[PDB]
Amino acid sequence: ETTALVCDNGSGLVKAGFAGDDAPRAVFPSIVGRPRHQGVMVGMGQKDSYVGDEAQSKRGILTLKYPIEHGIITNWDDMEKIWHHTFYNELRVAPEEHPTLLTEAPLNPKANREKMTQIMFETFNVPAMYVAIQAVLSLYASGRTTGIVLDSGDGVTHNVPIYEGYALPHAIMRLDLAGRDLTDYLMKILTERGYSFVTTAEREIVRDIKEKLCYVALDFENEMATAASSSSLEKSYELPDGQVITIGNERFRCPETLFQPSFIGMESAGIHETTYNSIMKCDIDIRKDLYANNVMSGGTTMYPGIADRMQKEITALAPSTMKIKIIAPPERKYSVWIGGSILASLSTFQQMWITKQEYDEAGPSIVHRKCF
Amino acid sequence: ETTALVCDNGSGLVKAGFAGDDAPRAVFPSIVGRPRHQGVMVGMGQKDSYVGDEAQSKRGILTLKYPIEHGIITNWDDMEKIWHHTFYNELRVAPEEHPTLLTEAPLNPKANREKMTQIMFETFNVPAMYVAIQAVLSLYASGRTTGIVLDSGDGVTHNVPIYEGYALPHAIMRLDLAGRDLTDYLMKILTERGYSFVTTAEREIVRDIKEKLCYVALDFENEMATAASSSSLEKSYELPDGQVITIGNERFRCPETLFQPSFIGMESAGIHETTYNSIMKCDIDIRKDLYANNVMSGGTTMYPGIADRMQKEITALAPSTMKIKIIAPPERKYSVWIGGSILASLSTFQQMWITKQEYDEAGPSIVHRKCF
Amino acid sequence: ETTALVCDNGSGLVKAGFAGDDAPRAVFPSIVGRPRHQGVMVGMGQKDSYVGDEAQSKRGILTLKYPIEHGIITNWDDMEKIWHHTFYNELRVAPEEHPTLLTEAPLNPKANREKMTQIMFETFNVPAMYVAIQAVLSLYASGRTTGIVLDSGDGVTHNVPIYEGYALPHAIMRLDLAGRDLTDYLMKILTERGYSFVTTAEREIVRDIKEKLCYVALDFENEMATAASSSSLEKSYELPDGQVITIGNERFRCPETLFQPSFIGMESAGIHETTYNSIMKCDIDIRKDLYANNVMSGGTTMYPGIADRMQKEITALAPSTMKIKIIAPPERKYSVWIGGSILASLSTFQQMWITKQEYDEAGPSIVHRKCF
Ligand SMILES: Nc1ncnc2c1ncn2[C@@H]1O[C@H](COP(=O)(O)OP(=O)(O)O)[C@@H](O)[C@H]1O
Ligand SMILES: Nc1ncnc2c1ncn2[C@@H]1O[C@H](COP(=O)(O)OP(=O)(O)O)[C@@H](O)[C@H]1O
Ligand SMILES: Nc1ncnc2c1ncn2[C@@H]1O[C@H](COP(=O)(O)OP(=O)(O)O)[C@@H](O)[C@H]1O
Ligand SMILES: [Mg+2]
Ligand SMILES: [Mg+2]
Ligand SMILES: [Mg+2]
């Protein structure tokens, strides 16, 4: 009768909530803020660390640290503070009477999963847990059983193909280019017009400009010629100190790094060629079902016009006799968590939990035996 | 008096030299490098393409491409540059006064042989050339006239049985599993410990780790239990940036792919079962000589302990009443070239060249009538 | 025959002269002074503006303005007067018969470059003009073709890595902390001893104290304990009004802001961590030629003992098994100009000038196409 806690601990945001729902209960950025100046006024609850939204609102006097870098946890006390805040302050539930479902990027280091096991069973100890792959949860949320997943979050962009219920681990591709790299590239190219941003409190502003003002160009050279020709593609955004900024071609030079990674010095191919090479690394007889079931998920797949560009590039790459259909649901931003809300609700899933007792015999190594 | 040129065009390395020698004169990787960044300094011989050791030493600013993949030439301008470099810069000879010996994997497409014919008679035009099968050259280097040759290089792995001078073309097996796939699998399994390698300049480093630290386990499960029990099978390697890495079971998980191709999602059987099925696709009365003269050659047969594992697996597969001998010469890495240094020096061979006037009479198609 | 005019327009000083020389002909501060009081004596050539050393000598009755702050030109009439004084009074040459070389900080706004081009081609119109990056000129002056440059001046501190003639623009780092902020921090800490300095005529005096009495401490806490223990680190300087001042620990507290930017409220990392993070933002293979060729140039890298502190911090940051070399030429204060005297004298450079007819063909937009 105890509900399961689905907790997607992504690189930029945390989506935590109960199983069986439609939307995540607590969505908050995964930052830990610490005071950087000196305190003069005595009293009024001057905490030494702020986690989440109060770190976001008080960000002018705080240095912000992300505990997760490219899907890998680096600072463990900060991630412990993140888990404590999302268990006791957001969901307001006791973790010792609820199973927990966690997500993990493919091709992660093993010690990351082992330390999640050790912390989750020795500090916020649970009756049981499970660790799942995010792309499988995306196919849960889409409702299909076949297709290839382009899941691009804040640190990790990965392609996973699954045909008729079976995963293909030899064609899973991973690229470390995601929305934090696009935020840094927007920070680099915003100095062309004179707008200088340095601090992490300015990184949040640059992230807000990236979410509210950027879109994917359909044709790159035609859009650059249109931007250089007439002044009709410039938008204005108001900073929190009152200055207005006006940006032009930088609206579509930021998400073009997703298709051309050579802008930031990476010699890897674009995500369209990554998807095409991941499809051609599979068996030949299943490629027809993979072309018609392109499913994307994540926060950086919500750009305006990315679906038409993806369709055009894959249609150029694929032979002309085949049907390529791109699936972009309007609720992809939480769809991985939505898969958790499907996965923990199934009665057949309720035997695959890693129990506390099984951990007590098997040590912190059973999670590679059970969870794939 | 004109010394013939033996030039082994392997998938990863090029071994070129004169006839009659004991060692190849020029051994260099078949890598074409191109600039990937922008150049701000003016002068000092900034070329647009680097070939060989110059591309290997300056690999940090270059995109590295292999012109040969799985024994099939894909890029022809790069392969022409490779031939120009190995004729005019390495061997320092004029190709118009020397006959040429070329090597080729079995079951190759014929258009590869026709285009190398047209190139070697129209751009670096020679008095004559011959194209030979590499397993025949390995059997020449062994000095025997019977036996099965397992030649495994950088792109291909082929088994050819030859009894008393007559090869059996219906029992020739080809597998597309070689050291490039072992390098890619070493990249895939090195992310378990957090060491991420993505670039081709890093792929050379992963190749160096594969050559200097990997070995074939005699028993797989006992070695995995020994690695999980104690940390006595862990070695350390120093990266060029000063960082050190430590690897454990990954020393023997990488070359186990040759015996179990299901690790990388290949459905085909291992190399021992391939040799066994190739031997009893021959006739019954010759199998005693084929079991007693099992010869390996190539760079990926230089793994420490691969011969004992091969002996054990063929001993298990064959009936126990007879003698199975695995012949691994210490110099097998260049032995195909050594076979060329035997074959181009024989006086009986000097009537089997494909001359210039024969090519002009019969087009670029006579290489299928003459060369087998 | 007509030599080029190399004019380093820095934030605090202007270094102008002819191409092919070893030292800059005219080195003068980039200030414009204006009268602030009323004049009762009529005659004697009372100008309404003083530029250069004339404003420096008569600075007691003038308000001094810098036209360039943080490498960005703000006042254009003052910068035009600076250019007119360095063309017609210091160099005493006609600008219409000499090509001009200009220097510019990386990650600069492009409107600065286009207004510089429009002014140089329509007011002091030239046959040709090229704009270069200062770190490239520093590597031209040092004579090598590889290494990372920490170029720190009066407005900007930037790190640029260049390997074998190829620059890496994705690893170029810029920090807006330079000698002006050190001068302001020296004013902020000089009120501890009762010496108050407010005006720009006092800014020149505080700058002179910073140049002739400050040095970089090796170990900060040990020199703080030495200054608090015994009176041995106090120096005396004579002000122009005859008063003497005595300073103690403030000799090394001022240049510690370059290593600890948190003293002036900036949360950015130190310049040693900036160099380290720029080097590990490059590729792995080229880091050995970057640790062995660390070059600095500019005025604020001329502190006593900054090279030893640099070597100690990068030695601590790098792995201990690898050599770090710090290169500080004695003539770094003009070395960027020295690179101009190398760059404009090469015969290979003479085909990359922006001509007058090219500018009239292509507008003021060719300068981003040609000059990187
Ligand atoms: N409308 C939008 N346009 C572009 N990018 C967006 C948009 N909304 C969110 N993002 C990006 O998505 C990233 C986080 O996506 P998400 O996958 O939900 O979180 P996580 O990666 O932590 O799982 C943020 O860094 C943000 O920059
Ligand atoms: N000591 C070694 N152990 C394992 N593999 C090796 C060793 N030396 C070379 N190799 C592998 O052999 C491959 C090339 O073998 P070789 O046949 O000599 O060249 P090619 O295949 O180009 O003819 C390389 O990819 C390398 O990975
Ligand atoms: N001996 C010195 N010690 C410390 N700082 C110095 C010294 N000499 C000059 N400087 C500083 O260098 C700055 C100017 O350096 P430079 O790079 O030559 O000029 P710019 O930055 O205008 O190109 C001045 O602001 C001055 O404070
Ligand atoms: Mg996510
Ligand atoms: Mg070979
Ligand atoms: Mg300067």
Coordinates of C-alpha atoms in Angstrom, one line a residue, chain C residues 82-231:
Chain C
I82 CA 45.1 59.9 -29.1
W83 CA 45.5 58.6 -32.6
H84 CA 46.1 62.1 -34.0
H85 CA 48.8 62.7 -31.3
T86 CA 50.6 59.4 -31.9
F87 CA 50.5 60.0 -35.7
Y88 CA 51.3 63.7 -36.1
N89 CA 53.3 64.5 -33.0
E90 CA 55.1 61.4 -31.6
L91 CA 55.9 59.5 -34.8
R92 CA 55.7 62.7 -37.0
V93 CA 54.6 60.9 -40.1
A94 CA 51.7 61.1 -42.6
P95 CA 49.1 58.4 -42.1
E96 CA 48.2 58.3 -45.8
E97 CA 51.4 56.6 -47.0
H98 CA 51.9 53.9 -44.4
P99 CA 50.1 50.6 -43.5
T100 CA 49.0 50.3 -39.9
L101 CA 49.1 47.3 -37.5
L102 CA 46.7 47.3 -34.6
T103 CA 46.3 45.0 -31.6
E104 CA 43.1 43.9 -29.9
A105 CA 42.0 41.8 -27.0
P106 CA 40.3 38.5 -27.6
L107 CA 36.5 38.1 -27.1
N108 CA 36.1 41.9 -27.8
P109 CA 32.8 43.4 -29.1
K110 CA 32.8 43.6 -32.9
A111 CA 31.5 47.1 -33.0
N112 CA 34.8 48.3 -31.5
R113 CA 36.6 46.7 -34.5
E114 CA 34.2 48.1 -37.1
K115 CA 34.4 51.6 -35.7
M116 CA 38.2 51.3 -35.6
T117 CA 38.1 50.3 -39.2
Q118 CA 35.8 53.2 -40.2
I119 CA 37.9 55.7 -38.3
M120 CA 41.2 54.4 -39.7
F121 CA 39.9 54.3 -43.3
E122 CA 37.9 57.6 -43.4
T123 CA 39.7 60.0 -41.0
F124 CA 43.4 59.0 -41.1
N125 CA 42.9 57.0 -44.2
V126 CA 45.6 54.4 -44.9
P127 CA 46.6 52.2 -47.9
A128 CA 46.2 49.1 -45.7
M129 CA 45.5 48.0 -42.2
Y130 CA 45.5 44.6 -40.3
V131 CA 44.2 43.8 -36.8
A132 CA 45.9 41.1 -34.8
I133 CA 45.6 39.2 -31.6
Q134 CA 48.2 40.1 -28.9
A135 CA 49.0 36.5 -27.8
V136 CA 49.9 35.6 -31.4
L137 CA 52.3 38.5 -31.4
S138 CA 53.7 37.4 -28.1
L139 CA 54.5 33.9 -29.5
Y140 CA 56.0 35.6 -32.5
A141 CA 58.3 37.6 -30.2
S142 CA 59.3 34.6 -28.1
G143 CA 60.3 32.8 -31.3
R144 CA 58.4 29.5 -30.6
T145 CA 55.3 28.1 -32.3
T146 CA 53.7 26.4 -29.3
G147 CA 52.6 27.3 -25.8
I148 CA 50.0 29.1 -23.7
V149 CA 50.1 32.8 -23.2
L150 CA 49.0 34.6 -20.1
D151 CA 48.9 38.2 -21.4
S152 CA 47.9 40.6 -18.7
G153 CA 47.8 44.3 -19.1
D154 CA 46.0 47.4 -17.8
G155 CA 42.5 46.2 -18.6
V156 CA 42.4 42.5 -19.6
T157 CA 44.1 39.2 -18.6
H158 CA 43.7 36.5 -21.2
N159 CA 45.1 33.0 -21.7
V160 CA 45.4 31.7 -25.3
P161 CA 46.9 28.3 -26.1
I162 CA 48.5 27.7 -29.6
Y163 CA 49.9 24.4 -30.7
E164 CA 52.2 24.2 -33.8
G165 CA 50.8 27.2 -35.5
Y166 CA 47.1 26.2 -34.8
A167 CA 45.1 28.2 -32.3
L168 CA 42.3 26.7 -30.1
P169 CA 39.5 29.3 -29.8
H170 CA 37.4 27.1 -27.6
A171 CA 40.0 27.2 -24.8
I172 CA 40.7 31.0 -24.9
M173 CA 40.0 32.4 -21.4
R174 CA 39.4 36.0 -20.5
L175 CA 39.4 37.7 -17.1
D176 CA 38.6 41.3 -16.5
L177 CA 41.1 41.8 -13.6
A178 CA 44.3 43.8 -14.4
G179 CA 46.5 46.6 -13.1
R180 CA 43.7 49.2 -12.8
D181 CA 41.9 47.0 -10.3
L182 CA 45.2 46.4 -8.4
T183 CA 45.6 50.2 -8.3
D184 CA 42.1 50.6 -6.9
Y185 CA 42.7 47.9 -4.4
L186 CA 45.9 49.6 -3.4
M187 CA 43.9 52.8 -2.8
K188 CA 41.4 50.8 -0.7
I189 CA 44.1 49.3 1.5
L190 CA 46.3 52.4 1.7
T191 CA 43.6 54.1 3.9
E192 CA 44.6 51.6 6.6
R193 CA 47.7 53.7 7.3
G194 CA 46.0 57.0 6.9
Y195 CA 47.2 57.9 3.4
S196 CA 44.1 58.9 1.5
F197 CA 44.2 59.1 -2.3
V198 CA 41.1 60.2 -4.3
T199 CA 41.8 62.1 -7.5
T200 CA 43.3 60.9 -10.8
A201 CA 46.4 63.0 -10.1
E202 CA 46.6 60.8 -7.0
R203 CA 45.9 57.7 -9.2
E204 CA 49.2 58.3 -11.0
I205 CA 51.0 58.4 -7.7
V206 CA 49.4 55.2 -6.4
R207 CA 50.3 53.6 -9.8
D208 CA 54.0 54.7 -9.3
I209 CA 54.0 53.2 -5.8
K210 CA 52.5 50.0 -7.2
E211 CA 55.2 49.8 -9.9
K212 CA 58.2 50.6 -7.7
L213 CA 57.4 48.9 -4.4
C214 CA 55.1 45.9 -4.9
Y215 CA 56.2 42.2 -5.2
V216 CA 54.6 38.8 -5.3
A217 CA 54.9 36.8 -2.1
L218 CA 55.8 33.1 -2.4
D219 CA 53.9 31.8 0.6
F220 CA 51.2 34.3 1.6
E221 CA 50.6 33.3 5.3
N222 CA 54.4 33.1 6.0
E223 CA 55.0 36.6 4.7
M224 CA 51.9 37.9 6.6
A225 CA 53.4 36.4 9.8
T226 CA 56.8 37.9 8.9
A227 CA 55.2 41.3 8.4
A228 CA 53.2 41.1 11.6
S229 CA 56.2 39.8 13.6
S230 CA 59.2 42.1 12.8
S231 CA 59.6 45.5 11.1

